[PDB]
């Protein structure tokens, strides 16, 4: 993975709100999704990659390879895993393994606009984030 390296803040919250309630999310974290644009900051720490996720409720850093399922401890009170693989350098299936299980979230960059389609059986929230230098 080296293509979409940077800090990334949300351009459109298309249904990034009912996707959280379908998983089962608290009435405090369910609205920073569609309010304070998540800083999903994908960066190489030496050799393997680190999400420096800096939001108002989830301000947290987590390091990972393309393979091992990395866990984030959330402001609901939930340690949620994320099974990673790069297809190549604009399609990466970083699939969130929660106490409900999120369905394949497919991180596809559309020319410096990181488009990760979050579905959960039947939702599909097109998460589009702009590259910040």
Which CATH number covers residue 18? 2.40.128.20
- The residues, ordered by sequence, that sit 6+ positions from 77 with a Cβ below 8 Å of its Cβ are none
Instruction: Supply the range of the domain harboring residue 77.
Output: 1-133
**Experimental method for this entry?**
NMR
What does the block give as tokens for 47?
A: 């050799």
Distance CA 95, CA 10 (A): 19
Total number of domains in the chain: 1
What does the block give as tokens for 51?
A: 């999400």
**Rounded to the nearest 5 degrees, what angle is found at the Cα of 102, between the Cα atoms of 74 and 5?**
70
**CB contact at 8 A, 127 and 10:** yes
Sheet holding 59-64, edge to edge: 42-45, 48-54, 59-64
87 assigned ligand-binding residue = no
DSSP sequence for 85-128: -EEETTEE--EEE-SS--B---EEESSSEEEEEEBSSS--EEEE
Residue environment code for 70-87, b if the CB has 16+ CB neighbours within 10 A, otherwise e: bebebbbebebebbbebe
30 assigned ligand-binding residue = no
Distance CA 128, CA 123 (A): 16
**CB contact at 8 A, 120 and 103:** yes
């Amino acid at each position: 993975m080296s293509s979409f390296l940077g800090k990334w803040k949300l351009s459109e919250s298309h249904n990034f709100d009912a996707v959280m309630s379908k998983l089962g999310v608290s009435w405090a974290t369910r609205q920073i999704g569609n309010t304070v644009t998540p800083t999903v900051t994908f960066t190489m720490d030496g050799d393997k990659m680190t999400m420096l996720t800096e939001s108002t409720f989830k301000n947290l850093s987590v390091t990972f390879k393309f393979g091992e399922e990395f866990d984030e401890k959330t402001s609901d009170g939930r340690n949620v895993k994320s099974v990673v693989e790069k297809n190549s350098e604009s399609k990466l299936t970083q699939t969130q393994v929660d106490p409900k299980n999120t369905t394949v979230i497919v991180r596809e960059v559309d020319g410096d606009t990181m488009k990760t389609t979050v579905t959960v059986g039947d939702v599909t929230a097109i998460r589009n984030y702009k590259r910040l230098s």
